[PDB]
């Protein structure tokens, strides 16, 4: 009980995201007739996530040339908004007073290649955010983390932990 | 005296602090 | 990362099975991935296919992980994928519960 | 269960199938004489008319593989599609004979692989179109593919495209199968017309009009209205279009689509969720 | 342990004369017995000790770019062969020890 | 006079010339230089290089895909894929794009850190009796006597 011993006694001993058929009775009736080899009335798709990757009904190749700015050039022998930073009024104007219509067709495709890459990057990010919630939903996790349990339940195994004799 | 110097087993995969934490954990 | 939501049991003779490591039984049972004759059958391809099948079974162990879903989800011939799936389910490790 | 009255139970099966017992000598007799692979694109289509099953699965297959009996693989596949044990009057023999026919017609990669192999190939660029339906999404895309190059990997390009588009994985094994299908159905039409694959001299009218012309300096950028075809579109379709698609020398003008009957699989995208559940229940009620 | 407890549980059942071990229902047990007896005869004539080796026991734990990766060993400081092996070793004759 | 940005090339790829063909590229990509195919010329390869790199350099935090390439440049898709892999190995394009924004495989996630139990057969472990005595024996009587 003395404080020379109390400090040493404890020292010596320390002691809307999927696109399946959500009815859980038409999927079973589909397989019950599919094993026979029969169609059914309703439709059933495979499971997936929602969302459409719709290109070419979106950002197009721009039209930097006029209706005849190439054939007339043929006769006369010639920070970011989406992916490109907005240029100042005076600095870009002398830059576009330098170029030639041999490079206008280059510039159109360069700017289209920037636009399509940004429009694929953001949709790719949204798609990864959707698949990370698909895989959690299909594995029993809710999101973002009389019943009878089967032996394949978390904590309901049949192989009980056997204890060693010294314990 | 002929004392057992147990902390001289400091072979490179282990260390003296590792042996001390091992002994204190098995006592815990 | 998904937390463990199921009980996983492999038989005791499959104690040697460890991910990111290729045991000798996997070499002596499926030798075509380790004789460097075909460039489309490397041990990296074998590790990719095996880790895919084992990771895909252990998400829902109550389901029989068929050959056809493994064939539809990784690109390869049906013979080698069928042989690898039958070897894998021979040693426990998939469709054991 | 071991705690019983001491019987001998040989090979208590998982589900309803006996374990596959290998040979282990033919495996080494085949794996050491292992020159090439020669993957075969295989197409299976059946309807409710003239057949009972539907079975719209497409797969690759090694032609040089003499290990696996094909009827055993087809019998494993039908068990994977959860067909009941009356599966011989809806024959495994019909599917086995279809797959036996489709690997016999496969004439292989021709003299572009057999006799010579010019590094870089030839100018034979073909217009690959594809049309894939998975769940309720439809991938429609066209590009150009050199059929005269041996080191063109379809699978390494399919994984690359499904990387960028973030596709689930049925598109991984459908795009590569479509490449392997159309390149083979062009190689077969070339070989049946006696093309003599080293000196080109193509000399035909249906082909040499499907082949694409030589890219010049000017044609290294495609026109804008011509660009909107060569871009991947992943359309979404509803139940009416899904029901419309559910009913409707090689002909190189009829390029088939890849619709697949869904496997009864829980986790995988592209398959119906019948069978054992994600939660482990039995539901004994009162 | 997995070998010995299989061998003992086979020896008790096979000598019982009331419990039949049929190989029609399972013909790959006999191949396991015979390959184990082959591989034990192999390392007995060479005096190799199995089951407790200090080797790692694991194998290789881990295109148009192989020439690029060859010169990548040049501009960073700035084709494997085939294998051959058999399922079973020599019968026990044609060994240098065994004459 | 025009606007400029910041580009970052790794140090082992300084040899890249935007107007010259390097000797590395003729031994890495030998299909454009056989001088026998008229559709794969060494002058149209520069039109692929100066469309990949010079479009990535305009906004280096956007991953330059390959479906953005074959939408425009009208070449063979496998040749553009091989050139897109070659320009990514030397870090010319797709370098200052942040990781985890790079495109990844859609696969079931890893189950490596899972705890497994084992079905061991009946006769594997021995029968154990005699619980061991963890407590040290006391010798008070011996030293007392």
Curated annotation (Swiss-Prot), chain A:
Full-protein residues shown: 229 to 567 of 623
Additional record remark: Present with 3180 molecules/cell in log phase SD medium.
Protein name: SWI/SNF global transcription activator complex subunit SWP82
Subunit structure comment from the entry: Interacts with SWI3 and SNF12. Component of the SWI/SNF global transcription activator complex. The 1.14 MDa SWI/SNF complex is composed of 11 different subunits: one copy each of SWI1, SNF2/SWI2, SNF5, SNF12/SWP73, ARP7/SWP61, ARP9/SWP59; two copies each of SWI3, SNF6, SNF11, SWP82; and three copies of TAF14/SWP29.
Function of the protein: Involved in transcriptional activation. Component of the SWI/SNF complex, an ATP-dependent chromatin remodeling complex, which is required for the positive and negative regulation of gene expression of a large number of genes. It changes chromatin structure by altering DNA-histone contacts within a nucleosome, leading eventually to a change in nucleosome position, thus facilitating or repressing binding of gene-specific transcription factors.
Compartment annotation: Nucleus
Protein family according to the UniProt entry: Belongs to the RSC7/SWP82 family. SWP82 subfamily.
Curated annotation (Swiss-Prot), chain B:
Subcellular location: Nucleus
Tree of life domain: Eukaryota
Note from the entry: Present with 3150 molecules/cell in log phase SD medium.
Quaternary structure annotation from Swiss-Prot or TrEMBL: Interacts with RTT102, SWP82 and the N-terminus of SNF2. Component of the SWI/SNF global transcription activator complex. The 1.14 MDa SWI/SNF complex is composed of 11 different subunits: one copy each of SWI1, SNF2/SWI2, SNF5, SNF12/SWP73, ARP7/SWP61, ARP9/SWP59; two copies each of SWI3, SNF6, SNF11, SWP82; and three copies of TAF14/SWP29.
Functional note: Involved in transcriptional activation. Component of the SWI/SNF complex, an ATP-dependent chromatin-remodeling complex, which is required for the positive and negative regulation of gene expression of a large number of genes. It changes chromatin structure by altering DNA-histone contacts within a nucleosome, leading eventually to a change in nucleosome position, thus facilitating or repressing binding of gene-specific transcription factors.
Protein name (record): SWI/SNF complex subunit SWI3
Entire protein: shown range: 514 to 541 of 825
Swiss-Prot record, chain D:
Localization in the cell: Nucleus
Family: Belongs to the SNF5 family.
Additional remarks: Present with 217 molecules/cell in log phase SD medium.
The protein's assembly and partners: Component of the SWI/SNF global transcription activator complex. The 1.14 MDa SWI/SNF complex is composed of 11 different subunits: one copy each of SWI1, SNF2/SWI2, SNF5, SNF12/SWP73, ARP7/SWP61, ARP9/SWP59; two copies each of SWI3, SNF6, SNF11, SWP82; and three copies of TAF14/SWP29.
Signal peptide stretch: none
Protein name as catalogued: SWI/SNF chromatin-remodeling complex subunit SNF5
Domain of life: Eukaryota
Function: Involved in transcriptional activation. Component of the SWI/SNF complex, an ATP-dependent chromatin-remodeling complex, which is required for the positive and negative regulation of gene expression of a large number of genes. It changes chromatin structure by altering DNA-histone contacts within a nucleosome, leading eventually to a change in nucleosome position, thus facilitating or repressing binding of gene-specific transcription factors.
Organism of derivation: Saccharomyces cerevisiae (strain ATCC 204508 / S288c) (Baker's yeast)
Curated annotation (Swiss-Prot), chain E:
Origin superkingdom: Eukaryota
Signal peptide: none
Annotated compartments: Nucleus
Additional information: [SWI+] is the prion form of SWI1. [SWI+] is the result of a conformational change of the cellular SWI1 protein that becomes self-propagating and infectious. This conformational change generates a form of SWI1 that assembles into amyloid fibrils. [SWI+]-aggregates sequester soluble SWI1, resulting in reduced growth on carbon sources other than glucose, reminiscent of a partial loss of function of the SWI/SNF chromatin-remodeling complex. [SWI+] can be cured by GdnHCl and by deletion of the molecular chaperone HSP104, which is required for [SWI+] propagation.
Record comment regarding domains: The prion domain (PrD) is a Gln/Asn (Q/N)-rich domain, which is unstructured in its native, soluble form, and which forms a parallel in-register beta-sheet in its amyloid form. The first 37 residues of this domain are sufficient for aggregation, propagation, and transmission of the [SWI+] prion.
Record-stated family: Belongs to the SWI1 family.
Subunit structure: Component of the SWI/SNF global transcription activator complex. The 1.14 MDa SWI/SNF complex is composed of 11 different subunits: one copy each of SWI1, SNF2/SWI2, SNF5, SNF12/SWP73, ARP7/SWP61, ARP9/SWP59; two copies each of SWI3, SNF6, SNF11, SWP82; and three copies of TAF14/SWP29.
UniProt name for this protein: SWI/SNF chromatin-remodeling complex subunit SWI1
Gene field: SWI1
């Amino acid at each position: 009980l003395s404080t020379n011993l109390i400090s040493k006694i404890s020292l010596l001993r320390p002691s809307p995201i999927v696109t399946e058929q959500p009815s859980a009775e038409i999927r079973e009736a589909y397989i019950e007739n599919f094993a026979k080899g029969e169609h059914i009335s309703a439709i059933v798709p495979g499971q997936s996530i929602s969302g459409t990757l719709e290109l070419s009904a979106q950002f197009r190749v721009p039209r930097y040339h006029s209706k005849n700015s190439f054939q007339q050039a043929l006769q006369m022998k010639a920070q970011y908004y989406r992916g490109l930073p907005l240029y100042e009024k005076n600095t870009l104007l002398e830059r576009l007073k330098q170029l030639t219509p041999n490079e206008i067709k280059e510039l159109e495709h360069l700017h289209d290649a920037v636009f399509v890459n940004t429009g694929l990057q953001n949709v790719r990010k949204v798609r990864t955010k959707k698949w990370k919630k698909y895989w959690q939903y299909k594995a029993g996790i809710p999101i973002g983390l009389k019943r009878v349990p089967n032996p394949n339940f978390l904590g309901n195994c049949n192989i009980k932990d056997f204890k060693p004799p010294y314990i | 005296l002929k004392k057992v110097k147990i902390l001289e087993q400091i072979d490179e995969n282990w260390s003296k602090e590792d042996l001390q934490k091992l002994l204190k954990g098995i006592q815990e | 990362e998904i937390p463990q939501a199921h009980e996983i049991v492999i038989p005791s003779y499959s104690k040697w099975f460890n991910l990111e490591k290729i045991h000798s039984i996997e070499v002596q049972s499926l030798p075509e991935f380790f004789t460097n004759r075909i460039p489309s059958k490397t041990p990296e391809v074998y590790m990719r296919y095996r880790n895919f099948m084992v990771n895909s079974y252990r998400l829902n162990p109550n389901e029989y992980f068929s050959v056809t879903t493994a064939r539809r989800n990784v690109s390869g011939d049906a013979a080698a994928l069928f042989r690898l799936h039958k070897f894998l389910t021979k040693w426990g490790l998939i469709n054991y519960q | 269960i071991t705690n019983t009255t001491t019987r001998v139970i040989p090979q208590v099966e998982v589900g309803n199938r006996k374990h596959y017992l290998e040979d282990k000598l033919k495996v080494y007799k085949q794996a050491m004489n292992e020159t090439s692979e020669q993957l075969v694109p295989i197409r299976l289509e059946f309807d409710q008319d003239r057949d009972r099953f539907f079975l719209r699965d497409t797969l690759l297959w090694n032609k040089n593989d003499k290990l696996i009996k094909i009827e055993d693989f087809v019998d494993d596949m039908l068990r994977d599609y959860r067909f009941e044990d009356a599966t011989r009057e809806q024959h495994i023999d019909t599917i086995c004979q279809s797959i036996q026919e489709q690997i016999q017609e496969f004439q292989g990669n021709p003299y572009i692989e057999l006799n010579q192999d010019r590094l870089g190939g030839d100018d034979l660029r073909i217009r690959i179109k594809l049309d894939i339906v998975v769940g309720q999404n439809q991938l429609i895309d066209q590009f150009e593919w050199d059929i005269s190059n041996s080191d063109n990997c379809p699978e390494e390009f399919a994984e690359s495209m499904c990387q960028e588009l973030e596709l689930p994985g049925e598109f991984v094994t459908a795009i590569a199968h479509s490449i392997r299908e159309q390149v083979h159905m062009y190689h077969k039409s070339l070989a049946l017309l006696g093309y003599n694959f080293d000196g080109s001299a193509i000399e035909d009218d249906d082909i040499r009009s499907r082949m694409l012309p030589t890219i010049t300096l000017d044609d290294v950028y495609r026109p804008a209205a011509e660009s909107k075809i060569f871009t991947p579109n992943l359309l979404q379709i509803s139940a009416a279009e899904l029901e419309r698609l559910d009913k409707d020398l090689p002909d190189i003008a009829d390029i088939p689509r890849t619709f697949r009957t869904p496997v009864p699989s829980t986790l995988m995208p592209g398959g119906v969720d019948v069978g054992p559940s994600v939660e482990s229940y039995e539901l004994r009620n009162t | 342990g997995e070998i010995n407890t299989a061998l003992n549980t086979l020896l008790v059942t096979s000598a019982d004369s009331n419990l039949k071990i049929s190989l029609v229902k399972y013909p790959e047990l006999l191949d396991s017995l015979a390959i184990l007896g082959m591989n034990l005869l192999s390392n007995l004539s060479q005096n190799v000790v199995p089951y407790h080796r200090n080797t790692s026991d694991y194998y290789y734990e881990d295109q148009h770019d192989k020439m690029v990766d060859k010169i990548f060993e040049k501009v960073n400081n700035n084709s494997p062969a085939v294998k051959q092996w058999d399922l079973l070793p020599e019968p026990i004759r044609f060994l240098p020890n065994q004459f | 006079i025009p606007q400029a940005h910041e580009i970052v090339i790794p140090s082992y790829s300084k040899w890249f010339n935007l107007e010259k063909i390097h000797s590395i590229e003729v031994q890495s990509l030998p299909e454009f230089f056989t001088n026998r195919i008229p559709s794969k010329t060494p002058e149209v390869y520069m039109r692929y290089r100066n469309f990949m790199v010079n479009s990535y350099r305009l906004n280096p935090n956007e991953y330059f895909s390959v479906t953005t390439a074959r939408r425009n440049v009208s070449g063979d898709a496998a040749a553009l894929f091989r050139l897109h892999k070659f320009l990514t190995k030397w870090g010319l394009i797709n370098y200052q794009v942040d990781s985890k924004l790079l495109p990844k495989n859609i696969e079931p996630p890893l189950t490596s850190q899972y705890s497994t139990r084992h079905d061991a057969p009946r006769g594997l472990f021995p029968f154990e009796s005699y619980k061991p005595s963890v407590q040290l024996p006391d010798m008070a009587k011996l030293k007392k006597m």
